[PDB]
Symmetry: C3
Subunit: 216 residues, 3 copies
Amino acid sequence: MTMIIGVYGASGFGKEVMPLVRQQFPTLSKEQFAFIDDGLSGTTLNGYPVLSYLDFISKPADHKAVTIAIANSVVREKLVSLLEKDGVQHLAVQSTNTVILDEVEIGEGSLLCPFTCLTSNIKIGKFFHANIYSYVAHDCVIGDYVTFAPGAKCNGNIHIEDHAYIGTGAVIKQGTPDKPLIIGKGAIVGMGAVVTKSVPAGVTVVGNPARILERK
Amino acid sequence: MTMIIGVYGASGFGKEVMPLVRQQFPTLSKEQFAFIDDGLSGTTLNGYPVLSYLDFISKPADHKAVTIAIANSVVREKLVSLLEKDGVQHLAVQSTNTVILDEVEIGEGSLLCPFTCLTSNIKIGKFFHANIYSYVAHDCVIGDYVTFAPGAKCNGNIHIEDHAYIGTGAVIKQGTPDKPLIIGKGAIVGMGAVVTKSVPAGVTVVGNPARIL
Amino acid sequence: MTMIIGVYGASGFGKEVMPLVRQQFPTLSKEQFAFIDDGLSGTTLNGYPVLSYLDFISKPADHKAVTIAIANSVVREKLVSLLEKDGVQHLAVQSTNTVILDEVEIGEGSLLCPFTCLTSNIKIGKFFHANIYSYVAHDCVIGDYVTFAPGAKCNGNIHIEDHAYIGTGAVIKQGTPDKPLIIGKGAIVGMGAVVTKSVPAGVTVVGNPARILERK
């Protein structure tokens, strides 16, 4: 009851995030960890209890911290507001084999999975998720609530705006110091996409080369 | 003499697997290792004897273990029954930098090369080969004799059936808990393919988006 | 005094390479390192001096050594010729997590970034550059001034001749011991390309499957 740690999201990447958090805090006992999930509430998962947000907040504990495993960026932002209302701490999570080089600034709530790499001179906003094998290269600027799926490749001089999603195995061409390649606010780079130029806000791009997807 | 280790396949991935098996068993002396290859039999490779299978089986050793470094799924299954006939052990081989998270069940004869990753809640059958940079994500089920080429990306809630082959740099969309994405028995996902829906048994798909070849 | 190390190239991969070379030679103090860049001569970068080539060469120091961060292989070759005139020593730089297996022969001036992998029975020429997540598999022969962009995947039995550039996220199909797949001298494999057959010297390919795009 000195500290309880929650992984918000029992389904999906939550099961991947839990062991990473266990490794971040190896001296905490298993009983100090829980999944938070309104829906899978009441159950157990991989030996951990699954709590509703109310049961989690109501637990007796001097300090509480949470990592939000939820991929959807809008939901992530919503859960964050909730956590802050209740004064819960945002946990930063990284993997043992993550590589980070020079002058990398990272906002709170980061989550960096195995085999991730951030090189040099990079600014990343809040609640950035980088799934396995994804990377950010030199002179990039990443906004808030950005999500990289596994194997997402963000090369040099790219600016990615808030709420963007870079899909599995996608690759993004480097920009230049004078002309960064921009991934627009809320833009979605679909899996396997090969992005050769800036992506407008709010569109989905797919294919090689990447093109705007007609969705209806 | 107490233990001899064989790497089945001297051409191809065999040369990559031997250093992995050497590191996996550091206290064994060089002389306890060999390639097994009918054909290159009698020769030498990176300082190791290359023996015929018969020659290998006949060596005086209390215990014998083999890793099959052959990517071809059908040959692999053939060599397995051969080994079992002679009571040779199936060696499991991982790389020093391989990552495995929670609740991963793996059948005998697995081979996980450098930079491989298995996440959480995964069931993998027998004689699974994952080459460099390949991964399996959450809640997947992988059958027997499945093979991942380098960089193959298997995302969450995917079921990959026996003898499937996932080509280099290929990427598979995640399923969901109610509807897994399924890679059918003996299906071939071609290199660089971008798979967005289930692949029927015995079929080859290629391209982005992946389409039947 | 005694030894100074230059990183040739302040822009592009320079800021990535500097911390790698720092780690390669951890007993050398920061003051013994500089970026070499005529354009940015006189400035400072990530707390390091940026020197013109002439000023670097003019330093009082028994021994001078350089790693060329520049990916552009044509420029890289001219720079080497420049460095040889002044008898500057060429450094080899790897990353801590780089993996190299059996019988890998590598010429001087190699640069292997984080998460790179060289397997077995490989011959690599001079001034090879492998950026993050790139690899070379078994039985490959790689010439001089070859550049692998990040995530470049060179499978088995491939011969990549002088000055070839393998683009970010590109994949090259394995050849056979009898029929190696050949990437011709000075060819350019475009980002994201899926190369299924030999590429002629001096041309560019792109796409899935890769097709010749620029041949004149």
